[PDB]
Design a protein around this ligand. Structure first.
Ligand code: GTP
Ligand code: G1I
Lengths: 50, 282, 334, 238
């Protein structure tokens, strides 16, 4: 009884194309790439653990 | 005397390599640093010193048939030899007693032995060996009295070993004979415990499913040391109890047979799978 | 009434497939590969008497907290390697730790089915228990701090709950899982959170409404770790079948799979870099691997542990990676 | 400046000293895990031994022991069992007089215990921990055998061809029929153990009732052999 109602509620949900989601994720990754100490090694004077 | 130099060079290289490998394997990896491994590093250091600064000079003196360094260096060499032999033998007895305590009483092994006690024991062993070796030699409490010793002592081209009966007996007793009885008793008790424990498995689950595993290990461990160091510590007493019985070349041969036991030690006390993995890493 | 459920499931499956215009692999073919990533240990923390099962970073990137099964809760100082506090515990079986966003409180839990909160900043005193949250049937698996007054916990009785620290009462409870719940992770804005259970499923709950929204059923074995993409519109999962997958909330289906033929061991933890490009996951074979998110190609390996890795975390500024293992050691990389 | 550094160093030193003090008492204690089926009788065993989770402290012969029972929690898939891979031994309690009753519809409870022991023995994490086995409820088993319309052959087919082992030490008051039935249940558990053993862990079977007082002695002696066999195997003499 409860499962039928739950699946009925979950059935009606708006969905978008996979291409749009992939493009958005890749755009975010490209935009935030410059400020990543792990992708681009930081100068030896900057990191506090060395 | 052609291949003898190559043979001695191979002996020296094997001793040095087999000791340094163990030393760096123990020092580098933290998971191998336990209470029991602190004795093995002491034994390895003693064997390494013996292979570095004892056997090369003896080989050179044997080849050249003369000593070309002086009296001070010859006496320094002899003291070092007596020290590295004495400090190498007693670590085996220490390890045997450690195993006896670990197996016989398992509920008190953790409390009985700690790092501080192990360090104290190692320091005491090294101090006793140094007191045995360096003191009576440099103070001249061992020199003989016949004319051959006097002739060899007063020249800088003679390097021979001469001792009186009392010092030879005392050195042999302190260095070799005392640890032997302790090791024999300890290993007999360990074998008894192992057999008594193996009987219970047969009594319990025998029908659903001897003593050939302990026998091999105990035989190797005892026989290597006994065959390596037994004849020398018999002829050492014999040649002073009643002279004109043993030739010199026999003495040197037996002493050198005792020497090579330092190279066989890492092949017996470092066969653990962790040690094998550490060796394969480097 | 099973026919209606089967028809609804078939309709959902049909609707999901119709919106798959393409795959992420084709779109990101022209992206320049990240290359090779090498990290070297900078610090090594010692002082734990047994294995370590939990770890969390503070909001300030200096202090972190670790939990062990010897009954200890040590707060470290990664910059200088100095212990700040050490809290004795009443129960020696602990499986989770958390650090409050403001740093005033620290939570813990385990096999005693009770969550405990310790008041770090006390006036003229020491660290002492401030509240014990009881009433949860199974052993706790994870706990995260929403605020200084609220907390979300999950246990092995197939349920999650939201508490109130001031009164020690359950504001709401979440039901629907058919197996033990193993982990959870809150959204960046703390409006939604996800949970991975032992029945090979993940859900997307709502904190305000207290009801499930979506369900993802990609994995074949149970789920051991869940994480949220920096953006907040995706998450990653780690399972016991030696695979990791990336899911999307808006597309409502799986996007990528991070698997290799050589690895045959389960995943214990996952985490993301700040930029969202690298996905780091622990493994049962004593080391960790780095997975490029957009191309699903391995770009490094961190092998410095002598036992199984049980926890993994990345600082908020994205400057270091902390890992724990069963050999009672912590390590800071890069 | 150095004003905070001095205090930080002092605090670190105090914490390190306390940790060093606590490690000594941590390393000199033994942990045991108490497992059993439903209605086996483990609560009585732990209650006599003493005299969320259930824990107990007791000391025998100046040796510190820690035995803790785990809440059932109605769990059939034990995901919490990987934590307990560093204990000294595992205590398994089974009722040997429960061969006839049926657990709602399934095999008899004795067959249920055998399945649990087999899964416990063949575990990825518990590939080293030994097992101490208590065959509880001995007196009820004798009553069923000595009288009643219950035959082990009807419920267990292998009992038809079973014969009493020669290496047996029956009690003076034991009936010849009771000794046959007591042992048959014992080799059922031993048979599962022997096959999968790597020589890294063994099984210790005992016969137990609810009135005997030597149970704490049996745990002491058997836990002594577990450590001794570990040392012998490590040094390659066993
Ligand atoms: N007469 C008799 N009764 C026993 C004996 N052993 C156990 N019992 C019964 O067992 C009862 C308590 O044990 P259980 O009912 O199995 O409860 P438990 O020990 O917690 O076992 P679990 O519920 O499975 O955890 C006692 O009230 C006894 O009646 C026995 O040897 N003789
Ligand atoms: C020639 N080298 C010495 C001579 C005598 C001697 C040795 C070692 C231990 C002793 O107790 C000794 O008395 C030998 O290493």
């Amino acid at each position: 009884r409860k499962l039928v109602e739950q699946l009925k509620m979950e059935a009606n949900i708006d969905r978008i194309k996979v291409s749009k989601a992939a493009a958005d994720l890749m755009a975010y990754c490209e935009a935030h790439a410059k400020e990543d100490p792990l992708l681009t090694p930081v100068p030896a004077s900057e990191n506090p653990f060395r | 005397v052609v291949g003898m130099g190559i043979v001695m060079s191979l002996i020296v290289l094997a001793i040095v390599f087999g000791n340094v490998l163990v030393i760096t394997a123990i020092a580098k990896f933290e998971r191998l640093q336990t209470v029991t491994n602190y004795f093995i590093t002491s034994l390895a250091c003693a064997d390494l010193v013996m292979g570095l600064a004892v056997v090369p000079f003896g080989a050179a003196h044997i080849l050249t048939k003369t000593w070309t360094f002086g009296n001070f260096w010859c006496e320094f060499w002899t003291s070092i030899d007596v020290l590295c032999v004495t400090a190498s033998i007693e670590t085996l007895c220490v390890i045997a007693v450690d195993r006896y305590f670990a197996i016989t009483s398992p509920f008190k092994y953790q409390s009985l032995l700690t790092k501080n006690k192990a360090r104290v024991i190692i320091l005491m062993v090294w101090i006793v060996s140094g007191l045995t070796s360096f003191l009576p030699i440099q103070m001249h409490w061992y020199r003989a009295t016949h004319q051959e010793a006097i002739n060899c002592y007063a020249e800088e081209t003679c390097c021979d070993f001469f001792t009186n009966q009392a010092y030879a007996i005392a050195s042999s007793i302190v260095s070799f004979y005392v640890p032997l009885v302790i090791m024999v008793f300890v290993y007999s008790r360990v074998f008894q415990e192992a057999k008594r424990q193996l009987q219970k498995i047969d009594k319990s689950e025998g029908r659903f499913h001897k003593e050939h595993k302990a026998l091999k290990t105990l035989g190797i461990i005892m026989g290597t040391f006994t065959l390596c160091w037994l004849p020398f510590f018999i002829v050492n007493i014999v040649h002073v109890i009643q002279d004109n019985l043993i030739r010199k070349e026999v003495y040197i041969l037996l002493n050198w047979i005792g020497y090579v036991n330092s190279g066989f030690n890492p092949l017996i006390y470092c066969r653990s799978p962790d040690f094998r993995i550490a060796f394969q890493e480097l | 009434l099973r026919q209606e459920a089967e028809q609804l499931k078939n309709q959902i499956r049909d609707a999901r497939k119709a919106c798959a215009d393409a795959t992420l692999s084709q779109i990101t073919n022209n992206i320049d590969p990240v290359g090779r990533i090498q990290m070297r240990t900078r610090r090594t923390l010692r002082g734990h008497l047994a294995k370590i099962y939990a770890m969390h970073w503070g909001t300030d990137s200096r202090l972190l907290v670790s939990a062990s099964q010897d009954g200890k809760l040590i707060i470290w100082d990664s910059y200088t390697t100095n212990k700040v506090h050490a809290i004795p515990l009443r129960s020696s079986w602990v499986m989770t730790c958390a650090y409050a966003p403001s740093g005033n409180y620290v939570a813990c839990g385990g096999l005693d089915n009770i969550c405990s909160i310790y008041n770090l900043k006390t006036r003229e005193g020491n660290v002492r228990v401030s509240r014990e949250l009881a009433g949860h049937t199974g052993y706790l698996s994870c706990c995260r701090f929403l605020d200084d007054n609220q907390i979300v916990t999950s246990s092995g009785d197939t349920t999650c709950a939201l508490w109130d620290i001031e009164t020690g009462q359950q504001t709401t409870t979440f039901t629907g899982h058919t197996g033990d719940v193993m982990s959870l992770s809150l959204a960046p804005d703390t409006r939604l959170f996800v949970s991975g259970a032992c029945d090979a499923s993940a859900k997307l709950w709502d904190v305000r409404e207290g009801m499930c929204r979506q369900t993802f059923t990609g994995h074949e074995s149970d789920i051991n770790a869940i994480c949220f993409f920096p953006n907040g519109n995706a998450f990653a999962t780690g399972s016991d079948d030696a695979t990791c997958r990336l899911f999307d909330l808006r597309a409502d289906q799986e996007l990528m799979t991070y698997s290799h033929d050589n690895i045959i061991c389960g995943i214990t933890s996952v985490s993301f870099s700040k930029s969202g490009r690298l996905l780091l996951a622990g493994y049962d074979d004593f080391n960790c691997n780095v997975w490029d998110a957009l191309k699903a190609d391995r770009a490094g390996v961190l092998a410095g542990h002598d036992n199984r890795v049980s926890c993994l975390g990345v600082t908020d500024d994205g400057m270091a990676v902390a890992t724990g293992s069963w050999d009672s050691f912590l390590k800071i990389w890069n | 400046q150095r004003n905070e550094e001095k205090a930080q160093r002092e605090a670190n030193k105090k914490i390190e000293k306390q940790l060093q003090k606590d490690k000594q008492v941590y390393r000199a204690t033994h942990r045991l895990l108490l497992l059993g089926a439903g209605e086996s009788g483990k609560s009585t065993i732990v209650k006599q031994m003493r005299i969320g989770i259930f824990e107990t402290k007791f000391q025998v012969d100046k040796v510190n022991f820690h035995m803790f029972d785990v809440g059932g929690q109605r769990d059939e898939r034990r995901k919490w069992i990987q934590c307990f891979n560093d204990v000294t031994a595992i205590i398994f309690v089974v009722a040997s007089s429960s061969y006839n009753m049926v657990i709602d519809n399934q095999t008899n409870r004795l067959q249920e215990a055998l399945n649990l022991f087999k899964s416990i023995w063949n575990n990825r994490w518990l590939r080293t921990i030994s097992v101490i086995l208590f065959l509880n409820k001995q007196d009820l088993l004798a009553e069923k055998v000595l009288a009643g319309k219950s035959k082990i052959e009807d419920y267990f087919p292998e009992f038809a061809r079973y014969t009493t082992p020669e290496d047996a030490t029956p009690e003076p008051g034991e009936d010849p029929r009771v000794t046959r039935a007591k042992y048959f249940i014992r080799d059922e558990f031993l048979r599962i153990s022997t096959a999968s053993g790597d020589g890294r862990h063994y099984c210790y079977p005992h016969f137990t009732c609810a009135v005997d007082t030597e149970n704490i002695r049996r745990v002491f002696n058997d836990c002594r052999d577990i450590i001794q066999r570990m040392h012998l195997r490590q040094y390659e003499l066993l």
